[PDB]
């Protein structure tokens, strides 16, 4: 499963297994039993 989107530069630590935050508590969640990789790269030039 490739989940692809764009976020604010701050809550890149909000995509992680097990956490609390306004991005993680309302718009996207990962289980604490996560197994996979998370890749993030900057974008204001696109």
């Amino acid at each position: 499963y490739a989940d692809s989107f764009v976020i604010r530069g701050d809550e890149v630590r909000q995509i992680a297994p097990g956490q609390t935050g306004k991005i993680a508590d309302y718009n996207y969640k990962l289980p604490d039993d996560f197994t996979g990789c998370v890749i993030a790269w900057n974008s204001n030039n696109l």
């Binding site: 297994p17 097990g18 956490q19 609390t20 604490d32």
Partner: protein, 46 residues
């Protein structure tokens, strides 16, 4: 009517062990408390 120590000792040993078993339900073993309703109230599931 005025000696049954061998019968008294086996009663005493069993009671002394059963009390030590219950008195262990109030040790931390290196945790924040001894109550599960206190770790399930000031900590998130992770």
């Amino acid at each position: 009517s005025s000696a049954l120590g061998k019968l008294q000792d086996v009663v005493n040993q069993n009671a002394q062990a059963l009390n030590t078993l219950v008195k262990q339900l109030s040790s931390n073993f290196g945790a924040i408390s001894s109550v599960l309703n206190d770790i399930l109230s000031r900590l998130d599931p992770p």
